[PDB]
Amino acid sequence: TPQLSGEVYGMLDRLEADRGKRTGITDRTRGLDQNTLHSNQAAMSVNQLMT
Amino acid sequence: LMRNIMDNIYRTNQGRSVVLDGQVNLEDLLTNEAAGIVRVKSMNSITPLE
Numbered sequence: 195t196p197q198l199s200g201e202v203y204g205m206l207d208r209l210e211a212d213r214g215k216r217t218g219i220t221d222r223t224r225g226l227d228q229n230t231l232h233s234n235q236a237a238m239s240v241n242q243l244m245t
Numbered sequence: 246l247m248r249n250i251m252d253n254i255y256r257t258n259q260g261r262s263v264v265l266d267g268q269v270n271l272e273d274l275l276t277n278e279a280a281g282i283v284r285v286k287s288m289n290s291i292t293p294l295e
Contacts, residue, residue: 208287219263240258241254241258244258
């Protein structure tokens with residue numbers, strides 16, 4: 195019988211990432227830094243990149 | 246030097262539609278030459294676009 199390939203997984207992952215793109219652009223809506231600390235490159239991310 | 250420093254502060258810190266690759270007519274032409282508030286291309290995942 196015919197099967198549905200990994201494209202279904204692909205756009206399910208895309209849409210699960212896109213759920214908040216229309217309201218909640220903030221990635222994962224919360225921070226998590228137990229291994230990777232804050233970066234220090236140029237005055238520590240000025241203006242939050244215009245927020 | 247100060248003007249280029251301000252350019253680094255201003256232009257280089259602009260978010261966008263966050264299209265992984267996309268076609269979307271260049272993401273609605275960079276959200277109508279503004280990139281202010283638009284991300285609807287197809288389903289693009291999280292990309293800061295620094």
